[PDB]
Design an enzyme around this catalytic site. Structure first.
Site, PDB file in Angstrom:
ATOM      1  N   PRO A   1      -7.627   4.007   9.432  1.00 29.11           N
ATOM      2  CA  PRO A   1      -8.698   4.691   8.685  1.00 29.11           C
ATOM      3  C   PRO A   1      -8.821   6.186   9.021  1.00 29.11           C
ATOM      4  O   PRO A   1      -8.228   6.644  10.002  1.00 29.11           O
ATOM      5  CB  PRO A   1      -9.964   3.952   9.123  1.00 29.11           C
ATOM      6  CG  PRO A   1      -9.489   2.679   9.721  1.00 29.11           C
ATOM      7  CD  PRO A   1      -8.170   2.984  10.344  1.00 29.11           C
ATOM      8  N   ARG A   2      -9.574   6.928   8.206  1.00 29.77           N
ATOM      9  CA  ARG A   2      -9.810   8.345   8.440  1.00 29.77           C
ATOM     10  C   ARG A   2     -10.570   8.481   9.751  1.00 29.77           C
ATOM     11  O   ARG A   2     -11.506   7.719  10.012  1.00 29.77           O
TER      12      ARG A   2
ATOM     13  N   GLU B   1      -9.215  -3.412 -10.039  1.00 25.10           N
ATOM     14  CA  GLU B   1      -8.222  -3.051  -9.019  1.00 25.10           C
ATOM     15  C   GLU B   1      -7.766  -4.225  -8.132  1.00 25.10           C
ATOM     16  O   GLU B   1      -6.648  -4.210  -7.637  1.00 25.10           O
ATOM     17  CB  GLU B   1      -8.746  -1.899  -8.146  1.00 25.10           C
ATOM     18  CG  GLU B   1      -8.777  -0.545  -8.851  1.00 25.10           C
TER      19      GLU B   1
ATOM     20  N   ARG C   1       0.808  -1.212   0.000  1.00 25.88           N
ATOM     21  CA  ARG C   1       0.000   0.000   0.000  1.00 25.88           C
ATOM     22  C   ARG C   1       0.834   1.251   0.000  1.00 25.88           C
ATOM     23  O   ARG C   1       1.642   1.447   0.895  1.00 25.88           O
ATOM     24  CB  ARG C   1      -0.902   0.057   1.222  1.00 25.88           C
ATOM     25  CG  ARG C   1      -1.781   1.310   1.250  1.00 25.88           C
ATOM     26  CD  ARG C   1      -2.052   1.846   2.610  1.00 25.88           C
ATOM     27  NE  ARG C   1      -3.467   2.130   2.736  1.00 25.88           N
ATOM     28  CZ  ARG C   1      -4.059   3.284   2.453  1.00 25.88           C
ATOM     29  NH1 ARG C   1      -3.381   4.350   2.034  1.00 25.88           N
ATOM     30  NH2 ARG C   1      -5.366   3.378   2.610  1.00 25.88           N
ATOM     31  N   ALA C   2       0.583   2.126  -0.972  1.00 24.33           N
ATOM     32  CA  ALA C   2       1.204   3.439  -0.995  1.00 24.33           C
ATOM     33  C   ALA C   2       0.489   4.359  -0.010  1.00 24.33           C
ATOM     34  O   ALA C   2      -0.742   4.411   0.019  1.00 24.33           O
ATOM     35  CB  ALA C   2       1.163   4.012  -2.398  1.00 24.33           C
ATOM     36  N   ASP C   3       1.265   5.076   0.802  1.00 23.88           N
ATOM     37  CA  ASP C   3       0.730   6.010   1.797  1.00 23.88           C
ATOM     38  C   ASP C   3       1.702   7.162   2.086  1.00 23.88           C
ATOM     39  O   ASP C   3       2.899   6.950   2.280  1.00 23.88           O
ATOM     40  CB  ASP C   3       0.404   5.271   3.100  1.00 23.88           C
ATOM     41  CG  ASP C   3      -0.859   5.771   3.747  1.00 23.88           C
ATOM     42  OD1 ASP C   3      -0.926   6.962   4.095  1.00 23.88           O
ATOM     43  OD2 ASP C   3      -1.851   5.052   3.941  1.00 23.88           O
ATOM     44  N   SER C   4       1.167   8.377   2.118  1.00 22.22           N
ATOM     45  CA  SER C   4       1.940   9.584   2.445  1.00 22.22           C
ATOM     46  C   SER C   4       2.466   9.612   3.883  1.00 22.22           C
ATOM     47  O   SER C   4       3.512  10.203   4.147  1.00 22.22           O
ATOM     48  CB  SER C   4       1.100  10.843   2.187  1.00 22.22           C
ATOM     49  OG  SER C   4      -0.228  10.763   2.681  1.00 22.22           O
TER      50      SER C   4
ATOM     51  N   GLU D   1      -8.412  -5.504  -5.100  1.00 23.40           N
ATOM     52  CA  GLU D   1      -7.896  -4.983  -3.833  1.00 23.40           C
ATOM     53  C   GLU D   1      -8.425  -5.716  -2.608  1.00 23.40           C
ATOM     54  O   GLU D   1      -9.474  -6.350  -2.648  1.00 23.40           O
ATOM     55  CB  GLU D   1      -8.146  -3.471  -3.710  1.00 23.40           C
ATOM     56  CG  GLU D   1      -9.589  -3.035  -3.522  1.00 23.40           C
ATOM     57  CD  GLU D   1      -9.772  -1.543  -3.770  1.00 23.40           C
ATOM     58  OE1 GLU D   1      -9.717  -1.122  -4.945  1.00 23.40           O
ATOM     59  OE2 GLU D   1      -9.961  -0.789  -2.791  1.00 23.40           O
TER      60      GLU D   1
ATOM     61  N   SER E   1      -7.075   0.062   2.477  1.00 25.21           N
ATOM     62  CA  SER E   1      -7.034  -0.793   1.298  1.00 25.21           C
ATOM     63  C   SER E   1      -5.595  -1.114   0.914  1.00 25.21           C
ATOM     64  O   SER E   1      -4.686  -0.354   1.228  1.00 25.21           O
ATOM     65  CB  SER E   1      -7.756  -0.119   0.122  1.00 25.21           C
ATOM     66  OG  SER E   1      -8.389  -1.088  -0.703  1.00 25.21           O
TER      67      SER E   1
END
Ligand SMILES: OC[C@H]1O[C@@H](O)[C@H](O)[C@@H](O)[C@H]1O
Ligand SMILES: OC[C@H]1O[C@@H](O)[C@H](O)[C@@H](O)[C@H]1O
Ligand SMILES: OC[C@H]1O[C@@H](O)[C@H](O)[C@@H](O)[C@H]1O
Ligand SMILES: OC[C@H]1O[C@@H](O)[C@H](O)[C@@H](O)[C@H]1O
Ligand SMILES: OC[C@H]1O[C@@H](O)[C@H](O)[C@@H](O)[C@H]1O
Ligand code: NA
Lengths: 102, 224, 103, 103, 103, 103
Positions: free
Chosen positions: B24-25, B107, B7-10, B109, B58
Site C-alpha cells: 500500500p501507499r 469492476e 494486478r497491473a503495477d508500474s 475486484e 487491489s
C-alpha cells in the site's frame, strides 16, 4: 578445477547429466538399519538416491553426503528449481554425485 | 485451490523483492502506522496506480480484467507488469464485504489487507508499451503447495473490517449489524483500525512461519 | 536399493506402512534424561515417535535419527504434506523408520 | 581485527574484492571424491569456488569452509543480495575467502 | 513410552506443565564463559531457560540441549504458537525439559 | 543465573550493553586463516564481531560461538529486530557475548 556441473561430470567414470529444470516432486528419508539414505523423484517419474555411506566412498565424501541430504530437503521445502543432477548411472536408482540450481 | 488474481503495477520485480511484496501507499516493507480501511480503499481514486491506498492493494478476477485497467491507468508506461497472485486469507471480495455500498461493482475486484507478500506472487508478465507479452516469468519466492491450499477470506471474516463511518446505515442493516465494532451504529474509527492491525498481525505470523521455516530447513544438528 | 518407501519397508521385519496424506498436527521434543525423543501426531489421533537412541540402533543409524528429528520439526512448521511413514509396529507408539513427503 | 571485508582482504596475499551487489545466479555443490566443493555464479558471468578441503588449509578453517557453503546455499535460495566477495586470485576459479551481505 | 508432553512430564520429579498457546516474545542467547545458554520470554512476563550443560545432565542430553536451543530460535523467528512446555521448577528461570507446538 | 541479557552483562567487568532495536544492516563471515569470524553492522555504523576462537575461550564456549554465527546469519536474512547485544569492549570491534531479539 571444473567451473560447472557438466565439466565436473566429465572427470568421473560411469556418470551422466540429467536436465530437469524442475522442482522436486517428493523427498523420502530413512533412518532404517542399513538404508540410511534419501530418495527424490520428479514429476516425470525420474528417481535419484543419495547413497548409504559405504566402502565405495573416501573419507572426505562423508561430510558431503550429509550436506547433499540437507540440500535436497531444503530445495524440496522451498520449491527450488533444480537445473541438473550429475549422477552415477551404474547404480539403481542413479546416485547423486552433484546438483546445480539456477 | 490454485486460482490466481491479477494486478497491473508500474513497480518492477526488483523493487517488489526489496519491498517484501506489492505494498500500500506509505508502507515501505511488508513486515514494517497507516490507516487500514476497506471502505476508504475502494472509494479511493486511481492516480497512476491501481487502487492501493488505505491499507489494501487491489486485484482483478482475470488477466483480461487486469490488462484493461492497466491500459486506463498506466498507458503512459513503456514498461509495466501484470502480477499473477495466489488467493489467500489476506484477500477480500470487495463487492461481498461492502455489499450494496460497494463503490465500483462492475469492476469485480478483490483487495489484500496489508499488501500482497512477495511469496504470494506466482509470477509476472511484462507489458512493453501497451502490448502484453506471452511469456510468464516465474517468481522463485513463490510457494505453490502452500498457497494452492488456501482461498480468499470469506465475507464473514470481512464484515467487521468493512470500515464504514459510525453514522452509516450499513451498521444497522444485515449482515454488518451483528459484526459491528463497538461504537459503530449501535471510537468506531479507532476500533476498526485496531481490528485491522490484529488481522494483519496474525496473517503475517502465518507467512513468516511458511517462509522462514523453509529458510531454516537446512539445519543439521549432528554436525555440531 | 529400493526406489521408494514401500519397497524399503518390505526389507525389514516387525514393520508396516501408514498412508497419511496430511500435514503434521503436532510436534513435541524432549531433552529429559532417557527420554530424548520426538513425538508427532496427526489430526486423526495417530501418534508416532522417533526413538531414543539405544542398543537396538547400530552406529550408522545415529546420524539419521538426528536427521529425522530435524525433518519432522521443520515439516511440521512448513505444513508439509507427508505421504507415508514406514514404522516399527512393535513399539508404542510406532517408531519412525522413514518418511516420504509429496503434494 | 578488521571492521569490514575490504580490510580483511588486505591482510592476505593474492586476494581481491569483487563488488557485486547482486543475488547469486546459480549454486552448485558436489559430493564426488576429491571434488567436495561449491561453485556459485552471477549474472555477469563471474565464477567462484569454495575450495576442496586440503593441505592449503589449517585446522581452524575446516569448520569455516563447511560454514561458507551453508552461507552460499541459503543466500542463493533466498535471493539474498551479496555486497562483496574477498577471493584468492591465485586459483581458477577464484576461491572465496569471505562474503559480506547487504542491501 | 509416553505419547504426549503431559504424561512425559509426570515421569520426572520437580516438573510442571505450562500452557502458553502463544508465540515467543523474546529470544536471548549467550556464548559467555559458564553462561552458555538461552532464554525465552512471553508477552506478559513468563520466562524460561535452556540450562548450561553440566554435571546434572547425562551424556545423551547434551545433543538434545543443542537441538532445543535451535527449536526455540526457529519458533521465535517463525512466530509459531507453542502449545506447552514441560519444565523443571527447581531452577530460575524454569529450565525447559520439553516443548510441544500444535496447528 | 541471569534472568535476562542486562543481568548477564553485569556479571562480567569488561562488558557493556548496546540497545539497537533495529535489524542487522550487513552480515560478513570469513574462512581465511586466523580470521574465521563473523562481523555485523547496523545502519548507525555500529560494528560487532564474533571473535575467532582462541585461548581466551574455554571448551564449552566453542560450540556456542558457532551457534552465535548461525544466529546472526538467519536473523539477518529474516530481518529480525535485534534488541540488545552484550559485548566485550576491550576489543575493536566489540566482540559479542550475547544477543537478545524482540519487536
Ligand atoms: O565415490 C562414489 C562412487 O564410486 C564409484 O566407484 C562407483 O561407481 C559409484 O557407485 C559411486 O558410489
Ligand atoms: O533400529 C531400531 C529398530 O531395531 C529393531 O531391532 C527393533 O526390533 C525395532 O523395534 C527398532 O527399535
Ligand atoms: O585458505 C586457503 C588459501 O591458502 C593460500 O595459501 C592459497 O594461496 C589460496 O589459494 C587458498 O587456497
Ligand atoms: O536433566 C537436568 C535436570 O537435572 C535435575 O536433577 C535438576 O533438578 C533439574 O533442574 C535439571 O537440571
Ligand atoms: O569469552 C571471551 C572473552 O574472554 C574475556 O575474559 C576477555 O577479557 C574478553 O576480551 C573476551 O575475549
Ligand atoms: Na490459492
Amino acid at each position: 578445477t571444473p567451473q560447472n556441473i557438466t565439466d565436473l561430470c566429465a572427470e568421473y567414470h560411469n556418470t551422466q547429466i540429467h536436465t530437469l529444470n524442475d522442482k522436486i516432486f517428493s523427498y523420502t528419508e530413512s533412518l532404517a538399519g542399513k538404508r540410511e539414505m534419501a530418495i527424490i523423484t520428479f514429476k516425470n517419474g525420474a528417481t535419484f538416491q543419495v547413497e548409504v555411506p559405504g566402502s565405495q566412498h573416501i573419507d572426505s565424501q562423508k561430510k558431503a553426503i550429509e550436506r547433499m541430504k540437507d540440500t535436497l530437503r531444503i530445495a524440496y521445502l522451498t520449491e527450488a528449481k533444480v537445473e541438473k543432477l550429475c549422477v552415477w548411472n551404474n547404480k539403481t536408482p542413479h546416485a547423486i554425485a552433484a546438483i546445480s540450481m539456477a | 485451490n490454485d486460482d490466481k488474481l491479477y494486478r497491473a503495477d508500474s513497480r518492477p520485480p526488483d523493487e517488489i523483492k526489496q519491498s517484501g511484496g506489492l505494498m500500500p501507499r506509505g508502507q515501505s516493507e511488508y513486515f514494517d502506522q497507516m490507516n487500514i480501511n476497506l471502505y476508504d480503499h475502494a472509494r479511493g481514486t486511481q492516480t497512476g496506480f491501481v487502487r492501493h491506498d488505505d491499507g489494501y492493494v487491489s486485484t482483478s478476477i482475470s488477466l483480461r480484467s487486469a490488462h484493461l485497467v492497466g491500459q486506463t491507468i498506466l498507458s503512459g508506461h513503456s514498461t509495466y507488469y501484470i502480477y499473477v497472485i495466489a488467493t489467500a486469507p489476506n484477500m477480500f471480495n470487495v463487492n461481498d464485504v461492502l455489499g450494496a455500498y460497494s463503490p465500483h461493482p462492475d469492476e469485480q475486484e478483490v483487495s489484500a489487507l496489508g499488501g500482497i507478500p512477495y511469496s504470494q506472487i506466482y509470477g509476472w508478465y511484462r507489458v512493453h508499451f501497451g502490448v502484453l507479452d506471452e511469456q510468464l516469468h516465474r517468481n522463485r519466492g513463490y510457494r505453490d503447495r502452500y498457497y494452492s491450499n488456501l482461498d480468499i477470506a470469506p465475507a464473514a471474516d470481512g464484515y467487521g473490517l468493512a470500515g464504514f463511518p459510525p453514522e452509516h446505515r450499513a451498521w444497522r442493516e444485515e449482515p454488518w449489524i451483528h459484526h459491528a465494532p463497538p461504537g459503530c451504529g449501535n471510537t468506531c474509527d479507532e476500533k476498526t483500525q485496531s481490528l485491522g492491525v490484529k488481522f494483519l498481525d496474525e496473517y503475517q505470523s502465518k507467512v513468516k512461519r511458511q517462509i522462514f521455516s523453509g529458510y531454516q530447513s537446512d539445519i543439521d544438528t549432528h554436525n555440531r
